[PDB]
Amino acid sequence: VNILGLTATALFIIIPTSFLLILYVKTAASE
Amino acid sequence: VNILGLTATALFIIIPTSFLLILYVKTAASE
Amino acid sequence: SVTPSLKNFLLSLVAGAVVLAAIAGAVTAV
Amino acid sequence: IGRIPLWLVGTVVGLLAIGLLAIFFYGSYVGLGSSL
Amino acid sequence: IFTVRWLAIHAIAVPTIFFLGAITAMQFIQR
Amino acid sequence: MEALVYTFLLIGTLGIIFFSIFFREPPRIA
Amino acid sequence: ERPFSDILTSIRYWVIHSITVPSLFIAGWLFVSTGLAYDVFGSPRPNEYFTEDRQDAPLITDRFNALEQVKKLSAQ
Amino acid sequence: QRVRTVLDMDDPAKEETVKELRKDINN
Amino acid sequence: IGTYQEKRTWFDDADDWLRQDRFVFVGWSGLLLLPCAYFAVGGWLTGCTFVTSWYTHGLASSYIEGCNFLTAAVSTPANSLGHSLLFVWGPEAQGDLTRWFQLGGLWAFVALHGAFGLIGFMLRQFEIARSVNLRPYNAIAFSAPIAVFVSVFLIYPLGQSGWFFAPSFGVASIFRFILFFQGFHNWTLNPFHMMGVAGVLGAALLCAIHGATVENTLFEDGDGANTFRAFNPTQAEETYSMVTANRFWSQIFGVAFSNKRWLHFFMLFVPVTGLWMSALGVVGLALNLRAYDFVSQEIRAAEDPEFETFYTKNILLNEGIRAWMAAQDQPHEKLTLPEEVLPRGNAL
Amino acid sequence: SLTLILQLVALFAVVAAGPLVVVLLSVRGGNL
Amino acid sequence: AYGEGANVFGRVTNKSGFVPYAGDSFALLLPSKWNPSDEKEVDSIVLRYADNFDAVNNVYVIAQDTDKSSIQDYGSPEEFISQFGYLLGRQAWAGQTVSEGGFDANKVSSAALLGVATEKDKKGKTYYKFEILSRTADGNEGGRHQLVKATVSNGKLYLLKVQAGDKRWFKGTDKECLGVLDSFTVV
Amino acid sequence: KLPEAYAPFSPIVDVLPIIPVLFILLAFVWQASVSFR
Amino acid sequence: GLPWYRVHTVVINDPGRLISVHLMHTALVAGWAGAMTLFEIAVFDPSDPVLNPMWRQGMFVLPFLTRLGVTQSWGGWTISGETSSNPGIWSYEGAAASHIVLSGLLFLASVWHWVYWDLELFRDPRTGKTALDLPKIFGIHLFLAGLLCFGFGAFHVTGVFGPGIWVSDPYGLTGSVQPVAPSWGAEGFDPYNPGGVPAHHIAAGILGVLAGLFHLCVRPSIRLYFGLSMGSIESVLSSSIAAVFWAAFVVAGTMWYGSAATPIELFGPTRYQWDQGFFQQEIQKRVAQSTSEGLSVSEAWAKIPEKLAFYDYIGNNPAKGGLFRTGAMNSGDGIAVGWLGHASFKDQEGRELFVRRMPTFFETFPVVLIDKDGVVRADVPFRKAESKYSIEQVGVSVTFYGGELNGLTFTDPSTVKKYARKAQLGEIFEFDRSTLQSDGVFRSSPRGWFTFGHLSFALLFFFGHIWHGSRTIFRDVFAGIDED
Numbered sequence A, B: 001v002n003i004l005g006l007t008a009t010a011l012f013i014i015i016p017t018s019f020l021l022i023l024y025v026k027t028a029a030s031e
Numbered sequence C: 001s002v003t004p005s006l007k008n009f010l011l012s013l014v015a016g017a018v019v020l021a022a023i024a025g026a027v028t029a030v
Numbered sequence D: 001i002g003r004i005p006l007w008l009v010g011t012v013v014g015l016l017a018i019g020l021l022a023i024f025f026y027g028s029y030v031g032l033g034s035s036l
Numbered sequence E: 001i002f003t004v005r006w007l008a009i010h011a012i013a014v015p016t017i018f019f020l021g022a023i024t025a026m027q028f029i030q031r
Numbered sequence F: 001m002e003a004l005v006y007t008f009l010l011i012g013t014l015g016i017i018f019f020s021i022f023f024r025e026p027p028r029i030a
Numbered sequence G: 001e002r003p004f005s006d007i008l009t010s011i012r013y014w015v016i017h018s019i020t021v022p023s024l025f026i027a028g029w030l031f032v033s034t035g036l037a038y039d040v041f042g043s044p045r046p047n048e049y050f051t052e053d054r055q056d057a058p059l060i061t062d063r064f065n066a067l068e069q070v071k072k073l074s075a076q
Numbered sequence H: 001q002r003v004r005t006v007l008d009m010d011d012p013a014k015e016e017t018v019k020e021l022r023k024d025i026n027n
Numbered sequence I: 001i002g003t004y005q006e007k008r009t010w011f012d013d014a015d016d017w018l019r020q021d022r023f024v025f026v027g028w029s030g031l032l033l034l035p036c037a038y039f040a041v042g043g044w045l046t047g048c049t050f051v052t053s054w055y056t057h058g059l060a061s062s063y064i065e066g067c068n069f070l071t072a073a074v075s076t077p078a079n080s081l082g083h084s085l086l087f088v089w090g091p092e093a094q095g096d097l098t099r100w101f102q103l104g105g106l107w108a109f110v111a112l113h114g115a116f117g118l119i120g121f122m123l124r125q126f127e128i129a130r131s132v133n134l135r136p137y138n139a140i141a142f143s144a145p146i147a148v149f150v151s152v153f154l155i156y157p158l159g160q161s162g163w164f165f166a167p168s169f170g171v172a173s174i175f176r177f178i179l180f181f182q183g184f185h186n187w188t189l190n191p192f193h194m195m196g197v198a199g200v201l202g203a204a205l206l207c208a209i210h211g212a213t214v215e216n217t218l219f220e221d222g223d224g225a226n227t228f229r230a231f232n233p234t235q236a237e238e239t240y241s242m243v244t245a246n247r248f249w250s251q252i253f254g255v256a257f258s259n260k261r262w263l264h265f266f267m268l269f270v271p272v273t274g275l276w277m278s279a280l281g282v283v284g285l286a287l288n289l290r291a292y293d294f295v296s297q298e299i300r301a302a303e304d305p306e307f308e309t310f311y312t313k314n315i316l317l318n319e320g321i322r323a324w325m326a327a328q329d330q331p332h333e334k335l336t337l338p339e340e341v342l343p344r345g346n347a348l
Numbered sequence J: 001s002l003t004l005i006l007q008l009v010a011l012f013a014v015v016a017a018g019p020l021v022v023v024l025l026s027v028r029g030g031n032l
Numbered sequence K: 001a002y003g004e005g006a007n008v009f010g011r012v013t014n015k016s017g018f019v020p021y022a023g024d025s026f027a028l029l030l031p032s033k034w035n036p037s038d039e040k041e042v043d044s045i046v047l048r049y050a051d052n053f054d055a056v057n058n059v060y061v062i063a064q065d066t067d068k069s070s071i072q073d074y075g076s077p078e079e080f081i082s083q084f085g086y087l088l089g090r091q092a093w094a095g096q097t098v099s100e101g102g103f104d105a106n107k108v109s110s111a112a113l114l115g116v117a118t119e120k121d122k123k124g125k126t127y128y129k130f131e132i133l134s135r136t137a138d139g140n141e142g143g144r145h146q147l148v149k150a151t152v153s154n155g156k157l158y159l160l161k162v163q164a165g166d167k168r169w170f171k172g173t174d175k176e177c178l179g180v181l182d183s184f185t186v187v
Numbered sequence L: 001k002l003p004e005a006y007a008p009f010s011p012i013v014d015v016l017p018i019i020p021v022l023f024i025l026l027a028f029v030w031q032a033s034v035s036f037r
Numbered sequence M: 001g002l003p004w005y006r007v008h009t010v011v012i013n014d015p016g017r018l019i020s021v022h023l024m025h026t027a028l029v030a031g032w033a034g035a036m037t038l039f040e041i042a043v044f045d046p047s048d049p050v051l052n053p054m055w056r057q058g059m060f061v062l063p064f065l066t067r068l069g070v071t072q073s074w075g076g077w078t079i080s081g082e083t084s085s086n087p088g089i090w091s092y093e094g095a096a097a098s099h100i101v102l103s104g105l106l107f108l109a110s111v112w113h114w115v116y117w118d119l120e121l122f123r124d125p126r127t128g129k130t131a132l133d134l135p136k137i138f139g140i141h142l143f144l145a146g147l148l149c150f151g152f153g154a155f156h157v158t159g160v161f162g163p164g165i166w167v168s169d170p171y172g173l174t175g176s177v178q179p180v181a182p183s184w185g186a187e188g189f190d191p192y193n194p195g196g197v198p199a200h201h202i203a204a205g206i207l208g209v210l211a212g213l214f215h216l217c218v219r220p221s222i223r224l225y226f227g228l229s230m231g232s233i234e235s236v237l238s239s240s241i242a243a244v245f246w247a248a249f250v251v252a253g254t255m256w257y258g259s260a261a262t263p264i265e266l267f268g269p270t271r272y273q274w275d276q277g278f279f280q281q282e283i284q285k286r287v288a289q290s291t292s293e294g295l296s297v298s299e300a301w302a303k304i305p306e307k308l309a310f311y312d313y314i315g316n317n318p319a320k321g322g323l324f325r326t327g328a329m330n331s332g333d334g335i336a337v338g339w340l341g342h343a344s345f346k347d348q349e350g351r352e353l354f355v356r357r358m359p360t361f362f363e364t365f366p367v368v369l370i371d372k373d374g375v376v377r378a379d380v381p382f383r384k385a386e387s388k389y390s391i392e393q394v395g396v397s398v399t400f401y402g403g404e405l406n407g408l409t410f411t412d413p414s415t416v417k418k419y420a421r422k423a424q425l426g427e428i429f430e431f432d433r434s435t436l437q438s439d440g441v442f443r444s445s446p447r448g449w450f451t452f453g454h455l456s457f458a459l460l461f462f463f464g465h466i467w468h469g470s471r472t473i474f475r476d477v478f479a480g481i482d483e484d
């Protein structure tokens, strides 16, 4: 799990940050 | 190279995809 | 046959029914 | 009705409880479980 | 009287002083 | 390899602390 | 409504509680001093703490015959 | 064959075997 | 109800007599909460003065043996009983209360009745919230104490060998159980446990900061130095300057709350999340699934005699804990470990 | 031992001195 | 659980801390706070007691058979001690080391003789009493004091040792150890 | 220890330390007796 | 508007999208099932069905495949040892393909139900507003549940039409899939008796059919309608999630304690079997028989099956891993290659010593040698200074019988210490480690991981049921209070 940890931590960072960023710019676009 | 290429491919398929999704949702939520 | 454990089970269940009846009586006796 | 003051009643109850706490703390230096 | 407050106070008043006197006798129990 | 990941993600954490401190949403008095 | 103020200051309440509380205290004293707790409870006294057979802590080590087992391992 | 010899053989290994937990009130 | 005649029956009479103003609210939930909670508290208070542990754990756990308040405990049943409920009528005791006490069956009795008391207390919260019609966020926050109770008093013994490894009802016995998880489970290094401790200390943060901030940004409402009487129970205006609070915390901390509702809900949110994650962690511990060993660090410590770390110090201290635990904490293993096999350092 | 009895009566003297003063001052006039 | 009253207002029963005990052809004082252990040390042990706090504070007896007439036939105290070196414990470490100091070569423990004695019984039998310090290279518990007493019954050579920690020796165990040592009377 | 002149006064002096804690308790008594004015 | 934690409440009152999202959840679950067993077949090693079984490789859905009757594979191998000459259409990855095509069909149906949401079926002819006939829907669903349960208990497990179930011997040696006759007595209520499962499902199906018919017949009353928040679909949600974490606690308990439908051969052992000396007691009474009548312990240890000795190992314990000792058990300790025999230790005078078995609670344990009478005779010396229990001075030799090493007596202190440390964990086995880069620590069984996940899920669903109970009874004052 030397680099399996890399890919797991990477996706665990990526999926919620992209999700939250998408819905945030949905909020901020409408004033 | 068996997993460093995997990490590079993952970063390449997410970071500009996420950036494009930011811009698209920023336009889609504005009418 | 009828085990002592089963006899104790029957006694416990009729005791629980008695407890439920006592609860009903205590709550209806204002 | 109010013949015995409420502060007096509280004082009696409090002194009973405090003296009883002192008795219980005395019971850690004698009796069972007192290292003697 | 025998009200709900009466029973609620008594069920926590009688046994606590019963065991309280028990502890009071129990402190002076010698070895 | 692990030290790079630890350092990068921790400096990202403190950087987003900085972002939330200074570049926050300004509240309104209305 | 008697909101815990007139009750404790009432001589009628105090007189009927001038007997019951000392009676409960005396009964609680005697319930331990006479050993009735030791009898109906199964708690071992310090004099009967150990039996002559075993000098160590008791071990039930059973699940179904534990009743008669604690009967023969207690202080009789 | 004898259950008492296998009892004393399981005991130094572990004291939680079911056969040690059953009919041990004689001990 | 529902603009229909609804002839009054036994259920209607019971409901009308039950949901009403008293000194203590009975209601429907009082059919279970009052007897179960009364039995639980009576059993525990009886156990800490009377119940000897000399036949369950081979210890002293009540005032009748000379123990104090902390060392007094309602002790768990013996592990030979496994996960039996130890009924007084059941095969363990068979109607004999006197030896049912010596079996430790009141541990299971009090734990069961306390679980039902927790259920009854949550049902009482729900029934009161229904009776006078506001949201049951008290029950929503109360969902975490029952999760902790289940996950540590039932889930852990049911996952392990038996109630003997369950915590006993008593302060020093809880301390024994806590050190038991410290040694056997490395509960400090467990991720869900760090989630929980972070949540609980953050709950202490929010409670202290909210009370201090509210009492320190209060409006005048005065002409008197005692600000407590400055509050009136019937007013529709703010009592503490929230905008001043927001400016103070924006300039002190960098961030501040812009909503009383979200502030109070996050104050609710931190300890319930912490306790739920701690419950999930002890649930994980229930099946011997721990965050005990870091594989790479133990490997490099194995092939490096100089590589000393605080983590390896903790690991070694934990096997020392367990080596000293086994003999005097597990009588049913009768582990007669000699003095020499016990690991120890130089001198001491 | 006589020291225990005189200790207990001294304790009684010091535990009663306060309540007697406050009770007598509460029943005799005021200004307290 | 028979019916009798509690013990109250009748003074204490035991405070000296010693409870008499007798076995086969011998009797001595045992500590009241000590618990006998089933871990038999040597193959010839009849009785063994130990402290519940630390297992170091232990004591046992030896009922080995004899081939001589008496301990006087064994001779001087040094010659008697020099034959029974198994009681202290052999070092299981065999590698040669000089990085420990203060001891002999390839040795991590030493037996420091603190004293010998010649104690007579009621009529003519001698009670050999000695004291041996059992240190280690690391000095665990600051060493260990060996308090040994020996005598001859009808056969069955009876030895004793009250082994205890040296920190316990100056922290409240020396008097109890001496009380155990001087009460080892064999008739 | 106490001398020949003050020998029976050891049970008297044995009670002296509890005066200030009993005194703050007396202050609570007085504040309760003035009905928490 | 609706926050991120309320997004799915866009379909609270839309039955077409409710059916659609249920369909696509069903599609995702079926697709995951197919993909998971494809991955498990791709990574499965059928090299040794006895010393490297599926639960030693972390196989999770494959033991459940082997539980209901699917034993062979299209790869020409069967887990029981036989060769699948004609495995049939229903293999492991064949069932995976069935799950995948079912997932595709369910996904297409979900898209269809999303694009066609305005269905007049969801409109009552009384007033035309959105409503669901919840009593009749539940009656119909209970009728189908009873019919399916009765069919599964009357044809699948009975074997007159289906394959039956996997039943093993008490000690988990042979194991077979066969039809099982129903047990209609208290033995049918024996949780370790497989004869109760057909009777259980038959009686449950009959009762469910009758209850569904009574629901289809009789309508509910006003009082329960206004009490249980019958008008809200969230009441159905709260009750159903209550039922499913009820079943989650049930499955966690039955997996941790073992039962008729929880075979050791397929799902691994239980920690209670190790703590109760089950396999050890079996081996030792198999030794007592045929040792008490001649042919002593020098031989007949080879008469002991190698699977039994593999079962008598604490590495085989499901509760010896960690929260983060991730993966297969073989990646933890290596793949077992052979049994070296039971170690018999003897000291210099002749008594037979035994190593103390490791309790499940410990990650490390000291090695001691105890006599028949129960007092420790030797130990691995930590101090080695003024110690008189060490093997180097006691003189204990170790001997082996019936394995790869038979009749070989080791006297060297280092090797007797090493093999005593190996026998501390139970039986003595050799493990290949360099093929999978074994770290050394023990992992956890699929049964243990199943129980942990389902216990956590059951706690989370208890929280969900409390929240949905609040939601059901308090559907009127969410946005605020009546302020009066």
Ligand code: CLA
Binding pocket: C012, C013, C014, C016, C017, C019, I031, I032, I035, I036, I085, I086, I087, I088, I089, I105, I108, I109, I112, I113
């Ligand atoms: C709020 C009321 C209430 C409730 C819900 C419970 C619930 C419980 N008690 Mg408890 N108990 C109560 C009051 C209550 N108790 C009171 C007032 C007392 C003092 C007398 C006790 C004293 C007590 C003891 C000493 C023990 C329990 C125990 C238990 C648990 C198991 C009981 C059992 O084994 O059988 C279950 C009982 C029932 C389900 C009662 C229901 C009766 C059924 C529905 C009717 C069947 C009877 C019927 C008449 C059959 C006869 C037919 C015939 C005419 C042909 C259980 C959760 C045991 C325990 O805690 O385990 C460790 C235990 O040992 N209770």
Ligand code: CLA
Binding pocket: M004, M005, M006, M007, M008, M009, M012, M237, M241, M460, M461, M462, M463, M464, M465, M467, M471
């Ligand atoms: C099948 C059971 C079920 C169903 C149908 C629902 C349905 C609903 N819930 Mg609910 N809930 C459930 C179980 C369920 N819940 C459980 C078990 C819990 C305890 C944790 C909760 C706690 C809960 C809360 C606190 C709230 C709801 C709310 C809601 C409503 C809006 C949901 C939403 O849009 O949030 C959106 C959810 C997301 C955008 C993402 C959630 C996914 C998280 C981050 C984990 C990811 C999991 C992973 C991808 C898949 C794992 C699934 C598998 C392991 C089971 C909705 C009708 C809300 C409500 O009632 O409205 C006021 C509300 O706030 N639920």
Ligand code: CLA
Binding pocket: A008, A009, A010, A012, M039, M040, M043, M057, M058, M059, M060, M323, M324, M325, M326, M327, M328, M445, M446, M447, M449, M450, M451, M453, M454
């Ligand atoms: C009922 C749920 C369940 C259960 C019981 C199991 C059980 C098991 N799986 Mg499995 N799996 C599941 C669901 C499940 N799985 C799902 C839904 C997927 C699809 C994603 C997979 C995909 C999968 C693969 C690819 C593999 C397994 C494997 C295994 C076996 C190895 C042990 C293990 O899982 O590692 C340890 C388990 C844990 C560490 C649990 C984690 C506990 C929580 C979730 C921690 C994470 C929380 C935190 C917020 C995450 C942040 C981390 C981030 C920084 C990276 C084991 C028996 C392996 C195997 O043997 O092959 C079959 C294997 O290679 N599983």
Ligand code: CLA
Binding pocket: M026, M027, M029, M030, M032, M033, M034, M037, M061, M062, M064, M065, M067, M068, M070, M095, M096, M099, M142, M145, M146, M149, M204, M205, M207, M208, M209, M247
């Ligand atoms: C054509 C129907 C069908 C069939 C024949 C199968 C067959 C199979 N499935 Mg499967 N499945 C199906 C539909 C089907 N599935 C659907 C629609 C889904 C999506 C939800 C799934 C999702 C799924 C998953 C995720 C998995 C399987 C798996 C499996 C295999 C092992 C089954 C198992 O062990 O799980 C156990 C099944 C049960 C325990 C069923 C219990 C039913 C519950 C407990 C009913 C209780 C509540 C009920 C309302 C009570 C009624 C009340 C009563 C009074 C009437 C097996 C070959 C497993 C596998 O190995 O993958 C290939 C697995 O991982 N399936």
Ligand SMILES: C=Cc1c(C)c2cc3nc(c4c5[nH]c(cc6nc(cc1[nH]2)C(C)=C6CC)c(C)c5C(=O)[C@@H]4C(=O)OC)[C@@H](CCC(=O)OC/C=C(\C)CCC[C@H](C)CCC[C@H](C)CCCC(C)C)[C@@H]3C
Binding pocket: I036, I037, I040, I041, I044, I110, I111, I113, I114, I115, I117, I118, I121, I125, I138, I139, I141, I142, I143, I144, I145, I168, I169, I170, I171, I174, I271, I272, I275
């Ligand atoms: C050890 C810490 C601790 C204690 C003692 C405690 C105590 C209490 N919490 C309550 C409430 C709550 N707890 C809450 C959040 C929290 N509570 C926490 C920590 C605690 N809370 C934490 C950390 C949180 C954050 C999530 C909420 C949200 C609530 C409430 O709604 C409620 C309240 O209004 O607060 C004031 C009260 C209602 C209990 C009751 O009557 O149940 C009825 C049932 C009874 C009495 C039977 C229980 C018997 C037990 C289970 C078995 C016997 C145990 C013995 C009596 C004692 C054993 C003690 C030894 C183990 C040492 C009670 C005073």
Ligand SMILES: CC(C)=CCC/C(C)=C/CC/C(C)=C/CC/C(C)=C/CC/C(C)=C/CC/C(C)=C/CC/C(C)=C/CC/C(C)=C/CC/C(C)=C/CC1=CC(=O)C(C)=C(C)C1=O
Binding pocket: F010, F011, F014, I194, I195, I198, I199, I200, I202, I203, I205, I206, I209, I210, I211, I213, I214, I242, I245, I246, I249, I253, I255, I256, I257, I258, I263, I269, I270, I273, I274
């Ligand atoms: C190289 C480097 C970087 C070195 C350091 C590296 C290092 C060692 C890193 C490790 C640190 C690290 C992050 C590890 C911890 C890991 C871990 C435990 C993660 C935490 C997980 C976590 C999410 C926990 C969830 C549990 C839970 C929900 C708790 C959260 C706690 C929480 C945030 C509570 C709030 C705390 C707090 C500071 C309160 C301030 C709130 C506030 C501003 C109120 C003030 C206020 C009061 C009023 O009354 C009014 C009216 C107003 C208006 C107002 O404002």
Ligand SMILES: CC1=C(/C=C/C(C)=C/C=C/C(C)=C/C=C/C=C(C)/C=C/C=C(C)/C=C/C2=C(C)CCCC2(C)C)C(C)(C)CCC1
Binding pocket: M028, M029, M031, M032, M033, M035, M100, M101, M102, M103, M104, M105, M107
């Ligand atoms: C369309 C189509 C098709 C195809 C289909 C397919 C191909 C499908 C599939 C699919 C798949 C292939 C699937 C899979 C999957 C998976 C899943 C679905 C999962 C998941 C998830 C989860 C649930 C998890 C969670 C978690 C994590 C994240 C980690 C660990 C922990 C936890 C658990 C938390 C067909 C031909 C048929 C038909 C026609 C067309």
Ligand SMILES: CC1=C(/C=C/C(C)=C\C=C\C(C)=C\C=C\C=C(C)\C=C\C=C(C)\C=C\C2=C(C)CCCC2(C)C)C(C)(C)CCC1
Binding pocket: D017, D018, D020, D021, E012, E015, E016, E019, E020, I038, I039, I040, I041, I042, I043, I044, I045, I046, I106
């Ligand atoms: C057991 C049991 C039971 C039950 C019972 C009941 C239900 C009851 C009760 C009871 C109780 C309930 C008891 C008690 C006790 C109590 C106590 C013992 C107390 C206490 C307290 C204290 C001691 C404190 C004091 C104080 C002070 C001094 C200081 C300050 C203030 C205060 C107050 C804190 C029966 C028999 C049925 C059977 C089964 C088992």
Ligand SMILES: CC1=C(/C=C/C(C)=C\C=C\C(C)=C\C=C\C=C(C)\C=C\C=C(C)\C=C\C2=C(C)CCCC2(C)C)C(C)(C)CCC1
Binding pocket: D007, D010, D011, D014, D015, D016, D018, J013, J014, J015, J016, J017, J018, J019, L016, L019, L022, L023, L024, L025, L026, L028, L029, L032
């Ligand atoms: C030198 C000397 C002296 C002197 C002394 C002084 C300088 C003073 C004093 C005094 C005092 C000092 C007295 C007293 C008393 C007191 C008391 C007796 C108290 C009390 C109280 C209580 C017990 C309670 C309270 C409370 C609380 C806190 C809570 C709530 C409310 C109430 C009120 C309940 C004399 C002459 C004696 C003689 C001897 C020696």
Ligand SMILES: [Fe+2]
Binding pocket: I214
């Ligand atoms: Fe506030």
